[PDB]
Symmetry: D2
Subunit: 115 residues, 4 copies
């Protein structure tokens, strides 16, 4: 799989478990077309979202449902969700890890792009 | 000034100047209506986006045009933009500062909410 | 004011108030000599630590007492403190803002260096 | 191994490879005693630093030589190094991952503590 999502919890110092993640691909008419989704595992990771054959060049949006995550922990959050929007490019390395570090009023995200 | 945006550059250790910012508000029909836009000053700050009267309750999206920023500096970055999505003024008027710290393959964002 | 420290709380979405900060400078004998100290205000800022005359070239350590901050709020955090270590004024006098964003098991820090 | 260090590069969107890491344990006289060290791998990770038997409760410092890393890439950095100082506690989960995300004028660090 060319796309993995990893989510961490900066309040508890843990993986962020059972977080819903939705991936969209930008269509020709600039709408967001559902592409893949899942929930992070006990290690905070979401594997197997797509395949090399399906993951063609284009703009993708990864939506991480941070609000539901914080509410399930009894914590009041700021954001509706975290969004990561990027272009997949065949010129670069083949594997994309989208990582996010979550706090109630803040988040960080980085891309780790490797061969 | 109930909505302010502040952007920093983590490569240069400086304000991120001339960063375009577009704000949207979710409409009754569930689309993103353009609400306000502007660009960061030499201090990396964007003031005057809206007014207390105009900044009513709603779900807002602050889109920070990070790709256009990096590309204007001769850099090819990872993200298209940073999107900050939040419910505002649910418990009455507040003042919101949306801060963002930018790197070519990573960003963080935090909200400072007062009064 | 050539050295300023600003601290934010990522759990509350607020300035981090009453955070103790201790600054050290590496001595000729390679030990950390106490240089200045203070605490953040209601704005999360710490001004007046030093003067242009006193803030000479050197290697400085800014220790932000994050554990004491979280514990004063009834929270058991991970880190003892955040340490920011840097060479200052190597190319002549500059103004340094050390910013830190705090969560119980995570922090970030960035420097804004001007003139 | 109860202690792992992971380092990421926010400029290149990659693991931070061949970064020197030094771990110290705080001695009874408040000095820092060398404990373990190594260099991050091609995946940006440093495994096998210590064992369960050696990693007793106490205060530890993880020093990440960020300055040499940026210089080897031809980039001018701000910090001398990144420091992560924490107490190992047997009450919590047994495995500590210290992660750091590096930019030239900024870094983030979080702890992922698991069983
Ligand atoms: O999101 C951030 C915002 C800020 C910041 C820094 C200075 C301000 O006057 C306002 C906000 O610093 C930071 C420092 C970091 O290391 C990481 C951040 O996300 C931020
Ligand atoms: O976005 C982040 C991702 C990670 C990370 C941690 C472990 C992985 O296997 C992959 C990514 O650590 C971090 C540590 C930080 O202090 C801040 C981050 O944004 C991240």
């Amino acid at each position: 799989c060319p796309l993995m999502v990893k989510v961490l919890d900066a309040v508890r110092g843990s993986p962020a478990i059972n977080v819903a993640v939705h991936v969209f691909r930008k269509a020709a008419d600039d709408t967001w077309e559902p592409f893949a989704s899942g929930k992070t595992s006990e290690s905070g990771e979401l594997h197997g979202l797509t395949t090399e054959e399906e993951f063609v060049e284009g703009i993708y949006k990864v939506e991480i449902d941070t609000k539901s995550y914080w509410k399930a922990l009894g914590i009041s959050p700021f954001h509706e969700h975290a969004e990561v929007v990027f272009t997949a490019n065949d010129s670069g390395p083949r594997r994309y890890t989208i990582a996010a570090l979550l706090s109630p009023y803040s988040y960080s995200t980085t891309a780790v792009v490797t061969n």
